[PDB]
Design a protein around this ligand. Structure first.
Ligand SMILES: NC(=O)COc1c(F)cc(SCCNS(=O)(=O)c2ccccc2)cc1F
Ligand SMILES: NC(=O)COc1c(F)cc(SCCNS(=O)(=O)c2ccccc2)cc1F
Ligand SMILES: N[C@@H](CCC(=O)O)C(=O)O
Ligand SMILES: N[C@@H](CCC(=O)O)C(=O)O
Ligand SMILES: [Zn+2]
Ligand SMILES: [Zn+2]
Ligand SMILES: [Zn+2]
Ligand SMILES: [Zn+2]
Lengths: 258, 258
């Protein structure tokens, strides 16, 4: 009866409540995906336990050992029944799991410290004073690894050898690093996150240029699990009801500091 | 599995959402008791259906036909499994139902249009220019009917014959009547409600003086129902957790307009 939903600590999707140690279970967290979990659980009528992924990753297949980590592994190895979070819909992932219809829209985007003299991928690629990175074990890193567009080819071979490593264990590490860096570190992340951080004090970061690509997050299920159907039917309803929009404003813009 | 919770449309305990016709079931409502229902249902782990009482009353025993109306009847006649709402803990009611430990504190209080020359019960009682009333089929009306304190004796025999009737079908009718009345109608209600309306535009009403008495609202159960135990254990926990307070600010003060 308690279906476990894997998920990840990422702001403002899921974050501990101010004072969370006061509470227990699902009540410990608050966020966009935390609101999304509840109300899906409300529409497919199910008991659920939010479970934050142990390794704190999204999910990439280890090239050598062939295993899946992050929330994607959770599902694949029968540890989670469902994933509510900012998990990008990807081909390599669709081969091993199910996605609902995307519940949010994003693209890869450049995050800069304010003032940094950069506007575009090409701007980043054609120089070497400003360093740049991405989240490790996510779809952004994979996008650059997989790409055969020349500018991205260049930006990839650079990162792949950059020392120290330009791949971060978390999103907050990139952000912290963009901010500590005095303009010598750009950080490639999803524009959803990017715009979240743009609205956060101390208001010293921003998105520059268009997204390199256009995709979305989906709720995920183990492959062929019978629960995909309902889950997806609930997403499509939340959209038509106007409720994803409501939550998106609530978490990013209404809370907005800059 | 779906335990029905009887409850009543009273602001800000339970109120339709802005545009509610967009939604269905429990999602149609929002309010303090709506938040309280959920999270009790969360702590005793139960599926529930919010059900707004048909006659829209609290509960009084008809003197003649001996029957109970309002949410209290619901419980007594096995129609509701539980009552989440501003139901005052009373002796006559405790004889026929169970109350948790009170989840909120109130007292009877005078509501006046701003400017009205009234400060106290005695002030009301000793004059006849300003008319005054209360909610029909509630504990306030009963309090005055039951009282043997002289000033309340006087205020009762007055009301009991006042034409037109000074007993209102709803709280909003008293309020509307206090506001339409240009200072010639005071309205006796619970200080919780009173302070809610004091914080509502157009900010032309207020509480005057102390409460005539001190009591509280409890979550109610059919008499000896096995569900009292848990329910009460959940209330005591919400209190110690600081969560009733949180909700009380959220619904009355943080939303405050005056
Ligand atoms: N909350 C929403 O309504 C957002 O939904 C959408 C949407 F309506 C359209 C798109 S187009 C971008 C590609 N579609 S995708 O994300 O399902 C995808 C991703 C990777 C490979 C193939 C298809 C995106 C949304 F998020
Ligand atoms: N949210 C809260 O903590 C409010 O709880 C309380 C409380 F702690 C004390 C009182 S004293 C007033 C009388 N106690 S009663 O309401 O349980 C009652 C009512 C009628 C006859 C006998 C006893 C009130 C609270 F609401
Ligand atoms: N949403 C990405 C993680 C963030 C990123 O790679 O920028 C994923 O599902 O892997
Ligand atoms: N809370 C009261 C209704 C309001 C009033 O009588 O002022 C009751 O339970 O009956
Ligand atoms: Zn902790
Ligand atoms: Zn809903
Ligand atoms: Zn309606
Ligand atoms: Zn709780």
């Amino acid at each position: 009866r308690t279906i476990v939903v894997t998920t990840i600590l990422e702001s403002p999707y899921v974050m501990y409540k101010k004072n969370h140690e006061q509470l227990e279970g699902n009540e410990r967290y608050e966020g966009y995906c935390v609101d999304l979990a509840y109300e899906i659980a409300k529409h497919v009528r199910i008991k659920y336990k939010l479970s934050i992924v142990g390794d704190g990753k999204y999910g990439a297949r280890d090239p050598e050992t062939k295993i899946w980590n992050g929330m994607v592994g959770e599902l694949v190895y029968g540890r989670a029944d469902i994933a509510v979070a900012p998990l990008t819909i990807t081909l390599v992932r669709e081969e091993v799991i199910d996605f609902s219809k995307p519940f949010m829209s994003l693209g890869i985007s450049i995050m800069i410290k304010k003032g940094t003299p950069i506007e575009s991928a090409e701007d980043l690629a054609k120089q070497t004073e400003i360093a740049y990175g991405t989240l490790d074990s996510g779809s952004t890193k994979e996008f650059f690894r997989r790409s055969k567009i020349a500018v991205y080819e260049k930006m990839w071979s650079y990162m792949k050898s950059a020392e120290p490593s330009v791949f971060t264990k978390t999103t907050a590490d990139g952000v912290a690093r963009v901010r500590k860096s005095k303009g010598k570190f750009a950080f490639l992340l999803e524009s959803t996150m990017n715009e979240y951080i743009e609205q956060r004090k101390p208001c010293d970061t921003m998105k520059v240029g268009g997204n390199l690509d256009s995709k979305g997050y989906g709720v995920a299920t183990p492959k062929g699990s019978a629960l995909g159907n309902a889950v997806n039917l609930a997403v499509l309803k939340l959209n038509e009801q106007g409720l994803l929009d409501k939550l998106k404003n609530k978490w990013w813009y209404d809370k907005g500091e800059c």
